[PDB]
A paper describes a structure:
With the exception of α-hemolysin, which is homo-heptameric, leukotoxins are bipartite toxins, formed by the non-covalent association of two distinct proteins, a class S and a class F component of approximately 31 and 34 kDa, respectively, into a likely octameric species. Panton-Valentine leukocidin (PVL) is associated with necrotizing skin infections, such as boils, and plays an important role in the poor prognosis of necrotizing pneumonia. Two additional structural domains are also found: the rim domain anchors the protein to the membrane surface, while the stem domain, closely apposed to the core β-sandwich in the soluble form, contributes two β-strands to the pore β-barrel. Since the binding of LukS-PV to the membrane is a saturable process, the necessary presence of a LukS-PV receptor on the cell surface was thus proposed. This was recently confirmed by Spaan et al. who showed that the C5a receptor is required for the binding of LukS-PV to human neutrophils.
The mutants exhibiting significantly decreased binding abilities with respect to wild-type LukS-PV were: R73A, Y184A, T244A, H245A, and Y250A, with Ki values ranging from 1.8 to 6.2 nM, i.e. a 69- to 238-fold increase compared to the Ki value of wild-type LukS-PV. Four LukS-PV mutants (R73A, Y184A, T244A, and Y250) displayed significant alterations for all measured parameters, i.e. at least 50-fold decrease in affinity for hPMN membranes, 2-fold decrease in the slope of Ca2+ influx and 2- to 10-fold reduction in pore-forming capacity. The T244A, Y246A and N248A mutated proteins crystallized in identical conditions (50% PEG 200, 0.1 M MES-NaOH, pH 7.50). The corresponding crystals belonged to the P43212 space group, with similar cell parameters (a = b∼94 Å and c∼308 Å) and 4 molecules per asymmetric unit. These crystals diffracted X-rays at medium resolution (2.50 to 2.80 Å). In the case of the rim domain, wild-type LukS-PV and mutants T244A, Y246A and N248A displayed only small differences, with r.m.s. deviations comprised between 0.20 Å and 0.30 Å, whereas the structure of the rim domain of the Y184A and Y250A mutants were markedly different, with r.m.s. deviations of 1.10 Å and 1.28 Å, respectively, when compared to the wild-type LukS-PV structure. Three of the four most sensitive residues (Y184, T244 and Y250) are found in this region, at close distance from each other. Indeed, three of the five most sensitive residues identified (T244, H245 and Y250) are located in this loop and form a surface that could represent the principal binding site for the receptor.
Numbering used by the authors: 2 to 121, 125 to 243, 247 to 284
The structure:
Amino acid sequence: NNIENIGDGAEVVKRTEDTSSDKWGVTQNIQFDFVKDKKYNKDALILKMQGFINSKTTYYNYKNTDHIKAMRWPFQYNIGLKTNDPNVDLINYLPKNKIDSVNVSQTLGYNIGGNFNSGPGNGSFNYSKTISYNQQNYISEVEHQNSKSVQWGIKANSFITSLGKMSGHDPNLFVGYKPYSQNPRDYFVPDNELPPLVHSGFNPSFIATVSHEKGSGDTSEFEITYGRNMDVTHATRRTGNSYLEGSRIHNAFVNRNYTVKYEVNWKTHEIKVKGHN
């Protein structure tokens, strides 16, 4: 049913965990793929990190003013995986390098004997998992890594505005066309002109493989963190005719994260949520 035979003397035990937080506006859909291979000297678990991180983009009036209005938006999305267990090792993860393409689609391949690789286009190994996500206008890069952790940043990068090409740091990024409006939303460009990561949110698709030493302990725990770093753009009406000017508070609210702690059983191939925030 949920055990797939992959080669001669090898199989994959597939488990799934789903957890949403109205507190953080995050859904975490984790796939745990246990590699049971006679020709491989270690226990191996492939984690596919998916779900949704709501952009939580809000538009509000600045204080008791009628002419200064603000937009709070996600400058960067946070994706992280850590283990406390001393017997566990982070052996790979996808994406490995800084990547600016609109759609990030990569493939991790496995071959009997503990051989892991990356797919070209399509390849045929014993087992494989594919990552697939869109990051229009954003850039993906590894912020931190060691044998126990991996942290990705999906940050605002390059945008084609009316005033030409803009960086993610441009203070006029997202300033609108309606200075006389009384609605904070009107002070900023419409959804049609916004990237999905700003108007809606992020659908992560990340992979990490962990190796456990056989018989060093039945259970292991991993913490998976999904979040966002929020910027504040203040649009002020300048007065011939009237226009709007933007000013930025960069990293106004950092580490708005949803962290879930999962417990894994190497013998029974069972999953438990230990806790969360």
